[PDB]
Coordinates of C-alpha atoms in Angstrom, one line a residue:
Chain A
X113 CA 11.2 -23.9 -3.2
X114 CA 13.0 -21.9 -0.7
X115 CA 11.8 -21.5 2.6
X116 CA 11.7 -17.8 3.7
Chain B
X197 CA -11.9 11.8 -6.0
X198 CA -8.9 9.6 -7.3
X199 CA -8.6 5.3 -7.3
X200 CA -5.6 3.8 -5.3
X201 CA -5.3 0.5 -4.4
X202 CA -5.1 0.7 -0.4
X203 CA -3.8 -1.4 2.1
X204 CA -5.6 -1.6 5.1
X205 CA -4.4 0.3 8.3
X206 CA -1.6 -2.1 10.0
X207 CA -1.4 -0.9 13.7
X208 CA -3.6 -3.7 15.0
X209 CA -1.4 -6.0 13.6
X210 CA 1.9 -4.6 14.3
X211 CA 1.3 -4.8 17.8
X212 CA 1.1 -8.6 17.2
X213 CA 4.5 -9.0 15.8
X214 CA 7.4 -10.9 17.2
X215 CA 10.7 -12.9 16.6
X216 CA 11.3 -16.5 17.0
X217 CA 14.8 -18.1 16.8
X218 CA 16.1 -21.6 16.8
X219 CA 19.5 -21.9 16.7
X220 CA 20.6 -19.6 14.1
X221 CA 17.1 -19.9 12.2
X222 CA 15.4 -16.5 12.9
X223 CA 11.9 -15.7 11.6
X224 CA 8.0 -13.4 13.0
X225 CA 6.0 -15.4 14.8
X226 CA 2.3 -13.4 15.5
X227 CA 1.1 -13.0 19.0
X228 CA -2.3 -13.4 20.4
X229 CA -2.9 -13.4 23.7
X230 CA -0.9 -16.2 25.3
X231 CA 0.0 -18.3 21.8
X232 CA 2.8 -17.1 19.5
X233 CA 2.5 -18.6 15.7
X234 CA 4.8 -19.1 13.0
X235 CA 6.0 -21.5 10.4
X236 CA 7.2 -24.6 11.7
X237 CA 10.0 -24.5 9.8
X238 CA 11.7 -22.2 11.8
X239 CA 12.7 -25.5 13.7
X240 CA 14.8 -26.2 10.7
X241 CA 18.3 -25.3 9.5
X242 CA 20.1 -24.9 6.3
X243 CA 19.5 -28.0 4.9
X244 CA 16.9 -29.5 6.9
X245 CA 14.1 -28.5 5.1
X246 CA 16.0 -30.5 2.4
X247 CA 13.4 -33.3 3.6
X248 CA 12.2 -32.5 7.5
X249 CA 10.4 -35.1 9.5
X250 CA 9.0 -31.9 11.5
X251 CA 7.5 -34.2 14.0
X252 CA 10.8 -36.3 14.7
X253 CA 12.4 -32.6 15.1
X254 CA 9.9 -31.4 17.5
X255 CA 10.0 -34.0 19.9
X256 CA 14.1 -33.3 20.3
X257 CA 12.7 -29.5 20.7
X258 CA 12.8 -28.4 24.5
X259 CA 10.8 -24.8 25.2
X260 CA 13.8 -23.1 26.2
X261 CA 15.2 -23.7 22.7
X262 CA 12.3 -21.1 21.5
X263 CA 14.2 -17.8 21.7
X264 CA 10.8 -15.2 21.8
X265 CA 11.5 -11.3 21.2
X266 CA 8.6 -8.9 21.2
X267 CA 9.8 -5.7 21.0
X268 CA 12.8 -5.8 23.4
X269 CA 11.1 -8.3 25.7
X270 CA 12.1 -11.5 25.6
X271 CA 8.5 -13.8 26.2
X272 CA 9.2 -17.0 28.4
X273 CA 7.4 -20.3 25.9
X274 CA 6.2 -22.6 28.4
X275 CA 5.0 -25.3 25.8
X276 CA 4.8 -26.1 22.1
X277 CA 3.2 -28.0 19.8
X278 CA 2.4 -28.5 16.0
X279 CA -0.8 -27.4 14.3
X280 CA -0.5 -28.5 10.4
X281 CA 2.8 -26.7 9.4
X282 CA 2.5 -23.9 12.1
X283 CA 4.4 -24.4 15.4
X284 CA 2.3 -22.8 18.4
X285 CA 4.0 -21.8 21.3
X286 CA 2.5 -21.0 24.6
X287 CA 4.3 -17.7 26.2
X288 CA 3.2 -16.8 30.1
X289 CA 2.3 -13.1 28.8
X290 CA -1.1 -12.3 27.3
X291 CA -0.4 -9.4 24.3
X292 CA -1.6 -6.6 25.5
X293 CA -2.1 -5.3 22.4
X294 CA -4.1 -8.4 20.7
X295 CA -6.8 -7.2 19.1
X296 CA -10.2 -8.5 18.1
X297 CA -9.6 -11.0 15.2
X298 CA -10.3 -14.4 13.5
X299 CA -8.5 -16.7 11.2
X300 CA -10.5 -17.6 7.9
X301 CA -9.4 -19.0 4.9
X302 CA -9.7 -16.8 1.7
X303 CA -10.7 -17.8 -2.0
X304 CA -8.4 -17.3 -5.0
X305 CA -9.2 -13.8 -6.2
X306 CA -9.6 -12.4 -3.0
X307 CA -7.3 -10.1 -1.8
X308 CA -5.4 -9.0 2.1
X309 CA -2.6 -7.1 3.2
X310 CA 0.5 -8.1 3.9
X311 CA 2.9 -6.9 6.5
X312 CA 5.9 -7.2 5.5
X313 CA 8.6 -8.5 9.1
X314 CA 12.2 -8.7 9.4
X315 CA 13.0 -9.8 13.1
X316 CA 10.0 -9.2 14.4
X317 CA 9.9 -5.7 13.1
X318 CA 7.3 -4.6 10.8
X319 CA 8.5 -3.2 7.1
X320 CA 6.4 -2.4 5.0
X321 CA 2.6 -3.2 3.7
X322 CA 0.8 -3.8 0.6
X323 CA -2.4 -4.9 -0.8
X324 CA -2.6 -8.3 -2.8
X325 CA -4.4 -10.7 -4.5
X326 CA -4.6 -14.6 -3.6
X327 CA -4.0 -15.9 -7.6
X328 CA -6.2 -18.1 -9.3
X329 CA -2.8 -20.7 -8.9
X330 CA -2.6 -20.0 -5.7
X331 CA 0.0 -18.3 -5.0
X332 CA 0.4 -14.3 -4.3
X333 CA 2.8 -12.0 -6.0
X334 CA 4.4 -10.7 -2.6
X335 CA 7.5 -8.6 -2.2
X336 CA 9.3 -11.3 0.1
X337 CA 13.4 -11.0 0.9
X338 CA 14.9 -13.8 3.6
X339 CA 13.9 -13.8 7.0
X340 CA 10.2 -12.6 5.9
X341 CA 8.9 -15.9 6.6
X342 CA 5.9 -15.7 9.4
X343 CA 4.7 -12.3 8.1
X344 CA 0.7 -12.0 7.8
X345 CA -1.8 -11.4 5.7
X346 CA -5.2 -9.7 6.8
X347 CA -8.5 -7.8 6.5
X348 CA -10.1 -5.8 8.9
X349 CA -14.1 -5.5 9.4
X350 CA -15.0 -2.9 11.8
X351 CA -12.7 -3.4 14.4
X352 CA -11.4 -7.3 13.7
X353 CA -8.5 -8.3 12.0
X354 CA -9.4 -11.6 10.1
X355 CA -5.9 -13.2 9.9
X356 CA -5.9 -15.6 6.4
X357 CA -2.2 -15.9 5.5
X358 CA 1.2 -16.5 6.9
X359 CA 4.2 -16.4 4.5
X360 CA 6.5 -19.7 4.3
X361 CA 8.4 -19.8 0.7
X362 CA 8.9 -18.6 -2.6
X363 CA 8.6 -20.5 -5.7
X364 CA 11.1 -20.7 -8.9
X365 CA 9.2 -17.5 -10.3
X366 CA 9.7 -15.7 -7.8
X367 CA 6.2 -15.8 -6.3
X368 CA 4.8 -16.5 -2.8
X369 CA 3.1 -19.5 -1.5
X370 CA 2.0 -19.8 2.4
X371 CA -0.4 -21.1 4.7
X372 CA -4.2 -20.1 6.5
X373 CA -3.5 -19.8 10.0
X374 CA -4.4 -23.1 11.2
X375 CA -1.4 -23.7 9.2
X376 CA -2.6 -25.4 6.0
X377 CA -1.2 -24.6 2.6
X378 CA -3.1 -22.6 0.0
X379 CA -2.5 -24.7 -3.2
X380 CA -0.6 -28.4 -3.0
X381 CA 2.6 -26.6 -1.7
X382 CA 4.6 -28.3 0.9
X383 CA 7.2 -27.1 3.1
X384 CA 10.3 -28.3 2.2
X385 CA 13.4 -27.2 -0.2
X386 CA 12.0 -29.6 -2.7
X387 CA 11.1 -28.9 -6.3
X388 CA 7.5 -27.0 -6.6
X389 CA 6.3 -25.0 -9.1
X390 CA 3.5 -22.8 -9.7
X391 CA 0.7 -23.7 -12.1
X392 CA 0.2 -21.8 -15.4
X393 CA -2.3 -18.4 -14.0
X394 CA -5.1 -16.2 -15.1
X395 CA -6.7 -13.2 -15.0
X396 CA -9.4 -12.7 -12.3
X397 CA -12.5 -11.7 -14.3
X398 CA -14.5 -11.1 -11.2
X399 CA -12.5 -8.1 -10.1
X400 CA -11.9 -6.8 -13.6
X401 CA -15.7 -6.2 -13.5
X402 CA -15.8 -5.1 -10.0
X403 CA -12.7 -2.4 -11.4
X404 CA -14.8 -1.8 -14.4
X405 CA -18.1 -1.0 -12.2
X406 CA -15.2 1.2 -9.8
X407 CA -14.8 3.3 -12.9
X408 CA -18.0 3.8 -13.7
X409 CA -19.2 4.8 -10.2
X410 CA -16.3 7.9 -10.6
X411 CA -17.2 8.9 -13.9
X412 CA -15.0 6.9 -16.1
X413 CA -17.8 5.6 -18.5
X414 CA -16.9 5.3 -22.3
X415 CA -16.4 1.8 -22.7
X416 CA -20.2 1.2 -21.8
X417 CA -22.2 0.1 -24.6
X418 CA -25.8 -0.6 -25.4
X419 CA -25.6 -4.7 -26.1
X420 CA -25.2 -8.0 -23.7
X421 CA -23.8 -11.5 -24.0
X422 CA -24.6 -14.4 -22.6
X423 CA -22.5 -16.1 -19.8
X424 CA -21.6 -18.9 -22.1
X425 CA -20.3 -16.3 -25.6
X426 CA -18.3 -14.4 -22.9
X427 CA -16.6 -17.0 -21.5
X428 CA -15.4 -18.5 -24.9
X429 CA -14.4 -14.9 -25.8
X430 CA -12.6 -14.6 -22.0
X431 CA -11.0 -17.7 -22.1
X432 CA -8.9 -16.9 -25.5
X433 CA -7.5 -13.9 -23.2
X434 CA -6.2 -16.5 -20.2
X435 CA -9.3 -15.2 -18.2
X436 CA -11.2 -17.1 -15.6
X437 CA -14.0 -18.6 -16.5
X438 CA -16.9 -16.7 -15.1
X439 CA -19.4 -18.4 -12.7
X440 CA -23.1 -17.6 -12.1
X441 CA -21.9 -17.3 -8.7
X442 CA -19.4 -14.5 -9.5
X443 CA -22.6 -12.4 -11.6
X444 CA -24.0 -12.7 -8.2
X445 CA -21.5 -11.6 -6.0
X446 CA -21.6 -8.4 -8.5
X447 CA -25.2 -7.6 -7.4
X448 CA -24.9 -5.0 -5.2
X449 CA -22.2 -2.8 -7.6
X450 CA -24.4 -4.2 -10.8
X451 CA -27.4 -2.3 -8.9
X452 CA -25.4 0.1 -7.9
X453 CA -25.0 1.6 -11.5
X454 CA -27.9 0.3 -13.0
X455 CA -25.6 -2.0 -14.9
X456 CA -26.4 -5.2 -15.4
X457 CA -23.5 -7.8 -15.1
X458 CA -23.7 -9.3 -18.9
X459 CA -23.8 -6.0 -19.9
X460 CA -20.6 -5.1 -18.3
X461 CA -19.4 -8.6 -19.8
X462 CA -20.4 -7.2 -23.0
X463 CA -18.0 -3.9 -22.2
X464 CA -15.1 -6.1 -21.4
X465 CA -15.3 -8.4 -24.2
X466 CA -14.8 -5.6 -27.0
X467 CA -12.2 -4.2 -24.2
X468 CA -10.4 -7.4 -24.6
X469 CA -10.7 -7.9 -28.5
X470 CA -10.4 -4.0 -29.2
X471 CA -7.7 -2.8 -26.3
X472 CA -8.4 0.3 -25.4
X473 CA -7.4 2.6 -28.6
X474 CA -5.6 5.1 -26.6
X475 CA -7.4 6.2 -23.7
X476 CA -7.4 5.3 -20.1
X477 CA -9.8 3.7 -17.5
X478 CA -9.2 5.1 -13.7
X479 CA -5.7 6.5 -15.2
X480 CA -5.0 2.8 -16.0
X481 CA -4.0 1.5 -19.6
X482 CA -4.6 -1.4 -18.5
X483 CA -7.5 -3.6 -16.7
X484 CA -6.6 -4.2 -13.2
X485 CA -7.5 -7.8 -11.3
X486 CA -6.6 -7.1 -7.9
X487 CA -9.4 -5.0 -6.5
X488 CA -12.2 -7.2 -5.5
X489 CA -16.5 -6.3 -5.1
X490 CA -15.9 -5.6 -1.6
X491 CA -12.8 -3.2 -2.1
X492 CA -14.3 -1.3 -4.3
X493 CA -18.0 -0.7 -1.8
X494 CA -15.4 -0.3 0.9
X495 CA -13.4 2.3 -0.9
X496 CA -16.1 4.1 -2.7
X497 CA -18.0 4.5 0.6
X498 CA -15.4 5.6 2.8
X499 CA -15.9 3.1 5.3
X500 CA -13.0 3.9 8.1
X501 CA -12.1 1.1 11.3
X502 CA -12.1 1.6 14.5
Chain C
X54 CA 12.2 -11.2 -4.6
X55 CA 9.1 -9.6 -6.0
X56 CA 8.5 -6.0 -6.2
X57 CA 5.2 -4.3 -4.6
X58 CA 4.2 -0.1 -3.8
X59 CA 4.6 -0.5 -0.4
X60 CA 3.8 2.0 1.8
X61 CA 5.4 2.2 5.7
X62 CA 3.4 0.3 8.5
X63 CA 0.7 2.8 10.0
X64 CA -0.1 2.3 13.4
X65 CA 2.6 4.8 15.3
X66 CA 0.6 7.3 12.3
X67 CA -2.9 5.8 13.2
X68 CA -2.5 6.4 17.2
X69 CA -1.5 10.0 16.4
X70 CA -5.1 10.5 14.6
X71 CA -7.8 12.2 15.9
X72 CA -11.3 14.4 14.9
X73 CA -11.4 18.6 15.0
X74 CA -14.8 20.3 14.4
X75 CA -15.6 24.1 13.8
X76 CA -19.6 24.1 14.1
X77 CA -20.5 22.4 11.1
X78 CA -16.8 21.4 9.9
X79 CA -15.2 18.2 10.7
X80 CA -11.7 16.6 9.6
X81 CA -8.9 15.1 11.1
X82 CA -6.1 16.7 13.3
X83 CA -2.5 14.9 14.1
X84 CA -1.8 14.6 18.2
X85 CA 1.1 15.0 19.4
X86 CA 2.3 15.5 22.9
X87 CA -0.4 18.2 23.9
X88 CA -0.8 19.5 20.8
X89 CA -2.5 18.7 17.7
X90 CA -2.2 20.1 14.2
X91 CA -5.3 20.7 11.4
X92 CA -5.6 22.5 8.4
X93 CA -6.7 26.4 9.5
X94 CA -9.7 26.1 7.0
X95 CA -11.7 23.8 9.3
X96 CA -12.6 27.5 11.0
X97 CA -14.4 28.1 7.6
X98 CA -17.8 28.8 6.3
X99 CA -19.5 28.0 2.8
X100 CA -19.8 30.7 1.1
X101 CA -16.8 32.2 2.9
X102 CA -14.1 29.7 1.5
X103 CA -14.2 31.5 -2.2
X104 CA -12.4 34.9 0.0
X105 CA -11.2 34.1 3.3
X106 CA -9.7 35.9 5.5
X107 CA -7.7 33.7 8.7
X108 CA -6.9 36.2 10.9
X109 CA -10.2 37.5 10.9
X110 CA -12.0 34.3 11.4
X111 CA -9.6 33.5 14.0
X112 CA -9.9 36.2 16.4
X113 CA -13.7 35.4 16.4
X114 CA -12.9 32.0 17.6
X115 CA -12.3 30.5 21.2
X116 CA -10.9 27.6 22.6
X117 CA -14.1 26.2 23.4
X118 CA -15.4 26.7 19.9
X119 CA -12.9 23.7 18.7
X120 CA -14.3 20.2 19.3
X121 CA -11.3 17.9 19.2
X122 CA -12.3 14.2 20.2
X123 CA -10.2 11.0 20.3
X124 CA -12.8 8.3 19.3
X125 CA -15.2 8.9 21.3
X126 CA -13.5 10.7 23.8
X127 CA -13.7 15.1 23.9
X128 CA -10.0 16.6 25.0
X129 CA -10.2 20.3 26.0
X130 CA -8.5 22.9 24.1
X131 CA -6.6 25.4 26.5
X132 CA -5.2 27.3 23.5
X133 CA -4.7 27.7 20.0
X134 CA -2.9 29.6 17.3
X135 CA -1.5 30.1 13.4
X136 CA 1.2 28.6 12.0
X137 CA 1.1 29.5 8.5
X138 CA -1.7 27.6 6.6
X139 CA -2.0 25.5 9.8
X140 CA -4.0 25.5 13.1
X141 CA -2.5 24.3 16.6
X142 CA -4.9 24.0 19.1
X143 CA -3.2 23.0 22.7
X144 CA -5.4 20.4 24.2
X145 CA -5.4 19.7 28.2
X146 CA -4.0 15.8 27.9
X147 CA -0.7 14.3 26.5
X148 CA -1.3 11.7 23.5
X149 CA 0.9 8.3 24.8
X150 CA 0.7 6.9 21.7
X151 CA 3.6 9.8 20.6
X152 CA 5.7 8.1 18.9
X153 CA 9.2 9.4 17.8
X154 CA 9.1 12.2 15.3
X155 CA 10.4 14.9 13.1
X156 CA 8.5 17.6 10.8
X157 CA 10.6 17.1 7.4
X158 CA 9.5 19.2 4.3
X159 CA 10.2 17.3 1.2
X160 CA 11.5 17.7 -1.9
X161 CA 9.2 17.0 -5.2
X162 CA 10.0 13.6 -6.7
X163 CA 10.1 12.1 -2.8
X164 CA 7.8 9.1 -2.1
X165 CA 6.0 8.7 1.7
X166 CA 3.2 6.9 2.8
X167 CA -0.5 8.5 3.0
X168 CA -3.1 7.4 6.0
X169 CA -6.0 8.1 4.4
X170 CA -8.5 9.0 7.5
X171 CA -12.2 10.5 8.2
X172 CA -13.6 11.7 11.1
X173 CA -10.2 10.9 12.8
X174 CA -10.4 7.4 11.6
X175 CA -7.8 5.1 9.7
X176 CA -9.7 4.0 6.0
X177 CA -6.5 2.9 4.5
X178 CA -2.9 3.5 3.7
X179 CA -1.3 3.7 0.3
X180 CA 2.3 4.9 -0.8
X181 CA 3.2 7.7 -3.1
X182 CA 5.2 10.5 -5.1
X183 CA 5.2 14.2 -4.2
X184 CA 4.9 14.9 -8.0
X185 CA 7.3 17.2 -9.8
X186 CA 4.7 20.1 -10.1
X187 CA 4.1 19.6 -6.3
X188 CA 0.4 17.9 -6.0
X189 CA 0.1 13.9 -5.0
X190 CA -2.0 11.8 -6.9
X191 CA -4.3 10.6 -4.1
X192 CA -7.4 9.1 -3.5
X193 CA -9.2 11.4 -0.9
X194 CA -12.8 11.8 -0.5
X195 CA -15.1 14.7 1.3
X196 CA -13.6 15.0 5.4
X197 CA -10.0 13.4 4.3
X198 CA -8.5 16.9 4.9
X199 CA -5.5 16.8 7.8
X200 CA -4.5 13.0 6.9
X201 CA -0.9 13.1 6.9
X202 CA 2.3 11.3 4.9
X203 CA 4.9 10.5 6.8
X204 CA 8.3 8.5 6.2
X205 CA 9.7 6.2 9.1
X206 CA 13.5 5.9 9.7
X207 CA 13.8 3.0 12.4
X208 CA 11.1 4.1 15.2
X209 CA 11.1 7.8 14.1
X210 CA 8.3 8.9 12.2
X211 CA 9.1 11.9 9.7
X212 CA 6.1 14.2 9.1
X213 CA 6.1 16.1 5.5
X214 CA 2.8 15.8 4.2
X215 CA -1.0 17.3 5.6
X216 CA -3.6 17.3 3.1
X217 CA -5.8 20.4 2.2
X218 CA -7.4 20.4 -0.8
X219 CA -8.5 18.9 -4.2
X220 CA -7.7 20.4 -7.7
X221 CA -9.5 20.7 -10.5
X222 CA -7.9 17.7 -12.4
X223 CA -8.6 15.5 -9.2
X224 CA -5.3 15.4 -7.6
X225 CA -4.6 16.9 -4.7
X226 CA -2.4 20.1 -2.3
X227 CA -1.5 20.3 0.8
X228 CA 1.1 21.7 3.4
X229 CA 4.3 20.5 5.5
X230 CA 4.0 20.4 9.1
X231 CA 5.1 23.8 9.6
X232 CA 1.4 24.4 7.3
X233 CA 3.6 25.9 4.4
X234 CA 2.1 25.0 1.2
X235 CA 3.9 22.2 -1.3
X236 CA 3.8 24.4 -4.7
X237 CA 2.0 27.7 -5.7
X238 CA -1.2 26.5 -4.1
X239 CA -3.5 28.6 -1.5
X240 CA -6.4 27.1 0.7
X241 CA -9.3 29.1 -1.2
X242 CA -11.6 27.3 -3.6
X243 CA -10.8 29.3 -6.3
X244 CA -9.6 28.4 -10.0
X245 CA -6.2 27.5 -9.3
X246 CA -4.5 24.7 -11.4
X247 CA -1.8 22.4 -11.4
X248 CA 1.1 23.2 -13.2
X249 CA 2.9 21.1 -16.1
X250 CA 4.0 18.0 -14.8
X251 CA 7.2 15.6 -15.5
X252 CA 8.1 11.8 -15.4
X253 CA 10.6 11.6 -11.9
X254 CA 13.6 10.4 -14.2
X255 CA 15.5 9.6 -11.5
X256 CA 12.6 7.2 -10.1
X257 CA 12.0 5.3 -13.7
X258 CA 15.8 4.3 -13.9
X259 CA 16.0 3.5 -9.8
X260 CA 12.7 1.0 -11.1
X261 CA 14.8 -0.3 -13.8
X262 CA 17.5 -1.0 -11.7
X263 CA 14.8 -2.8 -9.3
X264 CA 13.5 -5.0 -12.2
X265 CA 17.4 -6.1 -12.7
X266 CA 18.0 -7.1 -9.1
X267 CA 14.6 -9.3 -10.3
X268 CA 15.9 -10.9 -13.2
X269 CA 13.9 -8.7 -16.0
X270 CA 16.7 -7.9 -18.0
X271 CA 15.0 -7.6 -22.0
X272 CA 15.6 -4.2 -22.0
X273 CA 19.4 -3.9 -21.7
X274 CA 21.4 -2.8 -24.6
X275 CA 24.9 -2.8 -25.4
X276 CA 24.6 1.3 -25.9
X277 CA 26.1 3.9 -24.0
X278 CA 25.0 7.7 -23.3
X279 CA 26.0 11.2 -22.6
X280 CA 24.5 12.7 -19.9
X281 CA 23.6 15.4 -22.4
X282 CA 22.5 12.7 -25.3
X283 CA 19.9 11.4 -22.7
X284 CA 18.9 14.7 -21.9
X285 CA 18.1 16.0 -25.4
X286 CA 16.1 12.8 -25.6
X287 CA 14.2 12.2 -22.2
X288 CA 13.2 15.8 -22.4
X289 CA 11.1 15.2 -26.0
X290 CA 9.5 12.7 -23.5
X291 CA 8.2 14.8 -21.0
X292 CA 11.0 13.6 -18.5
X293 CA 12.8 15.3 -16.5
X294 CA 16.3 16.7 -16.9
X295 CA 18.9 14.0 -15.5
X296 CA 21.7 15.6 -13.6
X297 CA 25.1 14.6 -12.4
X298 CA 23.6 14.9 -8.4
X299 CA 21.2 12.2 -9.5
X300 CA 23.6 10.0 -11.7
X301 CA 26.0 9.9 -8.6
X302 CA 22.8 8.5 -6.2
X303 CA 22.1 5.9 -8.9
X304 CA 25.6 4.6 -7.5
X305 CA 25.3 1.7 -4.9
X306 CA 22.7 0.5 -7.5
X307 CA 24.5 0.4 -9.9
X308 CA 27.6 -1.3 -8.0
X309 CA 25.0 -3.9 -7.4
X310 CA 23.7 -5.0 -10.7
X311 CA 27.5 -4.1 -12.9
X312 CA 25.3 -1.8 -15.0
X313 CA 26.5 1.5 -15.6
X314 CA 24.6 4.4 -14.7
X315 CA 24.6 5.9 -18.3
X316 CA 24.6 2.4 -19.7
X317 CA 20.8 2.6 -18.1
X318 CA 20.2 5.6 -19.8
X319 CA 20.8 4.0 -22.9
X320 CA 18.0 1.5 -22.3
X321 CA 15.9 4.1 -21.1
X322 CA 16.6 6.0 -24.0
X323 CA 15.4 2.8 -26.4
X324 CA 12.4 2.9 -23.8
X325 CA 11.4 5.9 -24.4
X326 CA 12.0 5.8 -28.7
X327 CA 10.5 1.9 -29.7
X328 CA 8.5 1.5 -26.6
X329 CA 8.0 -1.5 -25.0
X330 CA 6.4 -3.8 -27.5
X331 CA 4.1 -5.6 -25.6
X332 CA 6.9 -6.6 -23.1
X333 CA 6.2 -5.9 -19.6
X334 CA 9.0 -4.8 -16.6
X335 CA 8.4 -6.0 -12.8
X336 CA 4.8 -6.8 -14.1
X337 CA 4.3 -3.6 -15.3
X338 CA 3.3 -2.2 -19.0
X339 CA 4.3 1.5 -18.5
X340 CA 7.6 2.9 -17.0
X341 CA 7.1 3.9 -13.4
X342 CA 8.4 6.9 -11.5
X343 CA 7.2 6.7 -7.9
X344 CA 9.6 4.2 -6.7
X345 CA 12.8 6.1 -5.6
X346 CA 16.1 4.7 -5.8
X347 CA 16.2 4.8 -1.6
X348 CA 13.3 2.7 -1.8
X349 CA 14.6 0.1 -4.3
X350 CA 17.7 -0.1 -2.1
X351 CA 15.4 -0.8 0.7
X352 CA 12.8 -3.4 -0.9
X353 CA 15.4 -5.1 -3.0
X354 CA 17.8 -4.7 -0.5
Chain D
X117 CA -10.3 23.5 -5.8
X118 CA -12.0 22.2 -3.2
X119 CA -11.0 22.2 0.6
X120 CA -11.0 18.6 1.5

């Protein structure tokens, strides 16, 4: 999970 | 003639995009009247996102810590709060470009246009569908958070999506404009995964109707199926189960073409079990699932927007 | 991550769209500063589009026979002239929404966004490529003429296409913004057909690079090829010959991915010879040719 | 050809  | 996946004209939304910065973190925000909406994770840094107490971090923030920029102009923020996974910043200027709008939560399978944005500047627009597994197969890079998805009806922009994150499989997750996630995802950089996904049966059927409307009808046959017999076959091909509700949603296209939904399902069954045998449908070699019944009507009727 | 057929945001163009009517014919026009550009065939009668003489039809018109409307509102025509296959109408007020712009003539194989319009109102926006044979595989209904294709560089709109007609195969033809047709087409309703079309090899290669930037790399192989040997195969499959200029253009993408251009050509050769075997690339089961190398670099970064 |  990567906050973009 | 011709059939293209089309996005809505993006002008009304472009006029609403701004840039929001908190220290070293910059993403996009949506400016409507005197409020700017953006992902609450703008108040984090490279590490915070691991397991942040947003409530705690927000209380430390002041209005002046939020740098809000619309084009060349800095918008003074005079208030803030959190609504679910969104930050709501109050600014001293009502957006003169605010369109008629509403916030809507769309259902899986349904489509919308995405205006990809970076540093508050719109970069590109594309149409996509909310997948059955509550992700979208988007195209997003670093800095894209805060980009929005929307439909337009007449003169009204219905905002339905704001972008928050990318999952390990390269698909995307986000919230409605009340800050509530689609799917079970959460806004922290933990380990999360998209579930298995299915083909949107409703949309494939709509698209088959679009094909018929456009004179592509080689796949029709003289048979029909029960809903249950269709679902037994389709589910082997990883298609969503078709419900009676979906059958009704296809009513207008069924009436236009005089082809009963279950009669179309018999055609689709034969396509799944037999493949295409060399032919195309609307020029495609595969069965398209990102056009809704509504997309079909809108496109085949030449609907415009004011 | 991800890869989409992406169009440019259409707002700067939306604010330029108007409606132009001559008698019973309405189509779209492009309103920049004090001028409106539209297809000249707006002046043509029904049984008249068979063999029109535009010099002759235009001299019979006055400024006041043209009805130009921005949405609800009529714009007074104070001048008119023909430039190739376009009419240029001077109107008595300026469009404050005029963006920074220029007129450009694109090369076959290049891409652009089309804002499809009807009666001067936006319907939708889509991205496409100009085919090697100068047609566009578009989505146009009746009344769509005068819709434009464009690219955007920063704040500058480069207008490259205005829509004029549909051909028997259902593909589309039109002009640049000086009114010169792309391809050997003329604005009259006769038997004309699109020429032989090829697959845009340069674009397919760029798209294979896009896939590699995206982690789809099953199609790679241990082989390389010469430019000549590649062309011998690709041309059997209706692909445009690849030139060294095209190789050069793929330099940046080659550097980013560490895959030599000719090594990618080798991959493409095998894909053509063996097919994809149920596999997909960037979600597709066919080789896509409507993304230029620039498109790939801009979207994947 | 059709002038669209």
